[PDB]
Ligand binder design. Sequence first.
Ligand code: KAA
Ligand code: KAA
Lengths: 134, 175, 323, 324
Amino acid sequence: TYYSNDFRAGLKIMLDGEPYAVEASEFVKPGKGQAFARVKLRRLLTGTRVEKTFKSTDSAEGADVVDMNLTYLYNDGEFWHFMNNETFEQLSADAKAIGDNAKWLLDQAECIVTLWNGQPISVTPPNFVELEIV
Amino acid sequence: TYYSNDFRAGLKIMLDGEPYAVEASEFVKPGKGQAFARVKLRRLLTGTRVEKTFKSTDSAEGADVVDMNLTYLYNDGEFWHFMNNETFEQLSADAKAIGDNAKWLLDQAECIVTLWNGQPISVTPPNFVELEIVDTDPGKPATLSTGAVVKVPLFVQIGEVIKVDTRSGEYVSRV
Amino acid sequence: ETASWQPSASIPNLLKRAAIMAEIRRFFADRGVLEVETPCMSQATVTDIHLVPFETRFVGPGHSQGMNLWLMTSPEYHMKRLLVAGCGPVFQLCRSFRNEEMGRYHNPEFTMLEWYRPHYDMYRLMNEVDDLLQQVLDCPAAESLSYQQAFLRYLEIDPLSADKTQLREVAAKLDLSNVADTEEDRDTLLQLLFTFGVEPNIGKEKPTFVYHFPASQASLAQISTEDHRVAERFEVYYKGIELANGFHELTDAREQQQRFEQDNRKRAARGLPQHPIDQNLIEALKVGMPDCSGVALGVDRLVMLALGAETLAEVIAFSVDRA
Amino acid sequence: SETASWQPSASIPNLLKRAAIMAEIRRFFADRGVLEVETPCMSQATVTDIHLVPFETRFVGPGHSQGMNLWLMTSPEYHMKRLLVAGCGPVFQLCRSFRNEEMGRYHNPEFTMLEWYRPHYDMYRLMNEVDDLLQQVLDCPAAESLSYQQAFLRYLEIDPLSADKTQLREVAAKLDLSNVADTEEDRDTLLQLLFTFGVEPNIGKEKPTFVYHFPASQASLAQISTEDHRVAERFEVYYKGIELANGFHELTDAREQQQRFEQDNRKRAARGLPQHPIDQNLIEALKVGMPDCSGVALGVDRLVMLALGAETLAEVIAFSVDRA
Ligand SMILES: NCCCC[C@H](N)C(=O)NS(=O)(=O)OC[C@H]1O[C@@H](n2cnc3c(N)ncnc32)[C@H](O)[C@@H]1O
Ligand SMILES: NCCCC[C@H](N)C(=O)NS(=O)(=O)OC[C@H]1O[C@@H](n2cnc3c(N)ncnc32)[C@H](O)[C@@H]1O
């Protein structure tokens, strides 16, 4: 758990059931009012930006969100497969997880995958790919 | 039991065995210097004024000094005798305590006796006393029943009683 | 750049800041408003619920006695004592302190500009402030909105009648449920909605005055005689920055003492320490203070907006971080 | 008898005249292009100056945050010197300063200070500027000025720079001060005892009196004279029995300055006084480079007091401690 006034950028926290990344935080305390934290967050499960308010005494649960640089295997039109050259483990990313990236996911290539609690939710393709001109 | 910068007019303190009464205390602390207490005191044994510096940390032990109204009764070459109107007890003051007021004491006079540890260290007679002239010639010097010599007008003769101001030792008027 | 020994404010910025200070003194000198200097330390403090002062202890010469003191959160109590003493209109540019307060726009110690105007109602005072913001910010005459119309405009809700349920869902639309659904204090709800629903959309082009705050948020202001629902309190905002808080001062000793007593009851009920009521201010109020209006403005914030700096630390020689 | 406590300690007329004096000082520097700066009242570090005891406070951050102790500034010097290094040029400040364990006719735990710094001014050129200010505000004549030495001869007929520790106590016994001198083993301590109770009460009677070139040992943060390394480039000005200002040709060597602080702490440890961590921000700034300059710290309250004919600090302060 982290305290409202520790919300530095890059912090992953659990909120109302979802994982978020802290983009920025600001201290707010209006005339005759209590102290707050105005936080700009990254709603991971949908890639959108949201803003939230917290009491300076509020806190949040750290969330499990790491970036594995797993290698892309192939997709069966529905799932995109990745593997760990060390762990030997594989993971499947659905269409919403890989999102608007399948365009550059060329068979056999290392990618940076953001997984929340093990399973992927974000796919970051190394945008230095050499592709075909069909 | 008292601190330098806590000294204050009236406080009775001890300094090298002698009793002193504080008149004024001033906090002093110069640039890059330590703190002091520059104070003015009255050397109670010599009715003298005096000034000295203490470190702000320095302390002084209290002193048992108190005034008290007593009535002078008599002198006998050894002690001047006064009496406590309340307690019914008496005190004896030597010639040091009587200081220079011996010549103003008349049986029955109310006097302010400054006591230190019980014993008297100074005596204050009434502001005005009424004494008879036991010798003088047709201002001019006159001798009082107390032995005191005062200047009076030329038209004042022996047998006449006058009032003198014991503070300035001057003739004030006739009685 | 950032080596800690270096000042957080740039020399160029410090040069202009000074110029604005002089501009401010002049402005008051031209209006015959006397300057005064009140203490930074005091045996008394304020009961205001959300403020938490600094404490320090005075020990006399030679380690004799001891005495706890509080750093002034504002010069207000002392200046009210002065108004009663008969000082006439006065202002002050002092350093104030507020613990637990640090951020982009807050520093534990900041410069406050506070002045009182005998015989000026909330409106005549506000006009004086506007004239000051116009000269320093070089902007147009501010706009004036009532707390009531500010809510209706930006949140289509009436803070004077709406109830916890109706306004708790406005909080959900602003996505503040996490801090609202669990709040049972109507005033705290309003503040939550105001600071996050109205403040950020206010004063975009020119500064904006908002008056008649709810009576519950009067602080030391008088309650309106017309509408007992609002107080003679106002604040002014610009570019999303809160610049000053002022009001038609409460002059009834009785009522003023009750509010302080309430502040202490609210603090204890929350686990916050209670602070002794400043008897001097009370006593002076009993003697009788002139009908007047006062206001406190955050100088650091004025300078910040005038030089277009992005943070308060940029217009302060040394913010706490490196003080 | 006394007026009710809610009331200010100084008369309103005095408060108005104080404001006029305040404006008069700002005008004076504004006319000479000296920049006004406001430095912090609270700081992570304090001074090591042996006889100063600073106020202390605790800063707690928003929400859950480790507390951080802070000291209230006894003077703005360390910040202004850092500002000097940052290239601010000639600057001055009218700030509120704080010093614990100081209460009296001429001291207030909190007081107002006028402190300014002149890049490339030597001790004498700064004193002259102090002279201009005093004449300006007090409307007195041009001050006189003597060295710490010739000031000691002229009143205690002793050469401070030479006179051994024994001759020192004789002059002490002369003015009845032996109660603090005899057991005293520090040469500068006796020298200070003599100076403030032997020279200060006799100077500045008719007009301000500057006293420069204090022993190299009482240099504080001032340079030691290049010529006579027995004295330090430091001066103090007095008037009507009141110490008004303390200034000096600033020590620019960071290496030297650091050691000096280390020596304060040791002298402190000895005296059983608490030690204080050396302000690294001042040292780091000194390492980068502080132009040669001179600074002075003037007690405004005492200046306003003299100007108004008041007899105590409390009569020129809105609210004295007992009413604060
Ligand atoms: N009776 C006169 C008005 C009283 C106002 C009341 N005492 C008060 O404090 N209002 S305030 O809004 O809390 O503060 C006034 C201004 O001070 C500024 N301020 C407050 N806290 C800080 C901090 N911590 N840093 C910088 N500036 C600050 C800001 O502009 C505020 O609008
Ligand atoms: N860097 C050059 C200036 C150094 C100044 C040095 N640090 C200093 O403090 N000198 S001082 O003599 O100790 O203080 C300067 C003046 O501040 C005033 N002063 C000091 N302490 C007090 C108090 N306690 N109350 C009121 N005025 C005070 C008085 O005029 C002193 O002469």
